[PDB]
Ligand SMILES: [Mg+2]
């Protein structure tokens with residue numbers, strides 16, 4: 174599972190869009206977003222670079238870039254978005270809803286939070 | 297007069313369905329606003345029903361693409377329409393506003409207050 | 421002419437019974453994972469026949485999200501047969517369109533009725549009970 | 553074997569019964585799965601008719617309550633069992649899926665795919 178700089182900028186764009194939706198400051202959730210993204214196999218500083226790059230692209234362009242991925246790559250993008258909002262393995266109703274919406278628009282497969290966690294472990 | 301093609305109106309209702317279904321619950325208030333205010337895009341009840349059916353045959357990613365390429369004035373009214381769906385008595389709750397914000401972000405729509413959305417729709 | 425002692429009855433439902441009714445209706449219509457705005461409108465319009473004011477409907481609907489489907493079943497299952505018949509009639513008219521119900525809809529209505537202990541009826545008998 | 557009590561096995565067959573009767577058609581292939589899989593809860597083949605008959609003594613709503621109160625591990629096996637009954641070659645049609653989901657919702661059972669149910673049982 175390789176990804177271009179453009180594709181990684183899209184993926185982090187989706188994570189950013191999702192976590193900003195509720196307007197709240199949530200330190201642990203941002204830290205999951207940043208730590209787990211490294212499982213794609215960049216370093217922390219590269220995650221920070223890519224996140225700042227994402228400010229310069231349209232979220233709608235990110236949608237398009239993601240939606241054209243093969244199913245294997247989409248499975249792990251969905252798994253990554255799923256683990257972000259997990260707390261002790263649980264997500265609440267409003268979090269599942271957001272994960273569900275961005276998944277639908279991106280054409281991503283449906284999964285449980287347990288599957289998303291198990292997916293990010295094998296990566 | 298503001299006009300929208302059939303594929304654009306299909307994309308719009310796809311977005312509305314995706315939004316109101318996101319939490320896996322039916323809130324009849326939201327489905328009633330969804331179908332009534334959709335008429336303000338210049339269509340009859342019979343066309344609304346057709347388009348709801350039409351939307352099942354498109355991918356939500358296709359709908360995103362169709363909306364995101366729209367001019368700013370039209371995106372303004374799509375954002376507004378999505379806003380009034382989730383609103384009640386001029387108020388939006390947190391969970392619902394989070395969903396409206398996210399879908400707006402993904403579709404390239406302008407941010408607005410709920411007051412603004414309600415007033416925009418009164419002008420169509 | 422002899423008139424006749426008068427007998428009055430009123431069909432009554434507790435708040436949690438009403439919440440249960442609407443939770444059963446939601447569960448039935450979500451089963452196939454699709455939303456039909458027409459079925460939802462009949463659902464809310466005909467719910468009023470249960471004896472509530474329009475402005476109470478929204479909060480009862482909101483109360484339904486805080487209860488388990490399994491608890492709504494327990495609450496319906498223990499009703500007397502007259503009230504069960506009315507609940508079954510209600511569920512039966514939600515998915516009917518022009519007094520007809522397709523086989524899949526009929527199956528869903530049959531299954532929920534079985535689980536809640538409601539009487540079996542045709543969609544015609546459903547539609548009449550609700551009209552009076 | 554996932555362990556259930558006698559009164560639980562009674563509730564489970566009552567739910568499988570309710571589900572397969574919903575459309576008015578009692579398909580031998582489905583009854584075969586209903587039979588073969590229930591054996592994996594520690595019931596001999598000849599005994600499935602006995603449990604089915606024992607289920608006449610309880611109402612469907614009482615079966616619902618016996619299932620709704622079970623722990624999440626027991627629930628998983630109940631949902632998986634109900635899911636495989638109407639499946640064919642690993643697939644389930646849209647109508648069958650709608651029936652499985654309604655009964656799962658009413659019994660407070662977890663959502664799963666037909667593939668999960670198959671592998672849970674296997
Ligand atoms: Mg909803």
Ligand SMILES: [Mg+2]
Pocket residue numbers: 449450451452453454455456
């Ligand atoms: Mg439906």
Ligand SMILES: [Mg+2]
Pocket residue numbers: 571572573574575576577578579
């Ligand atoms: Mg059958």
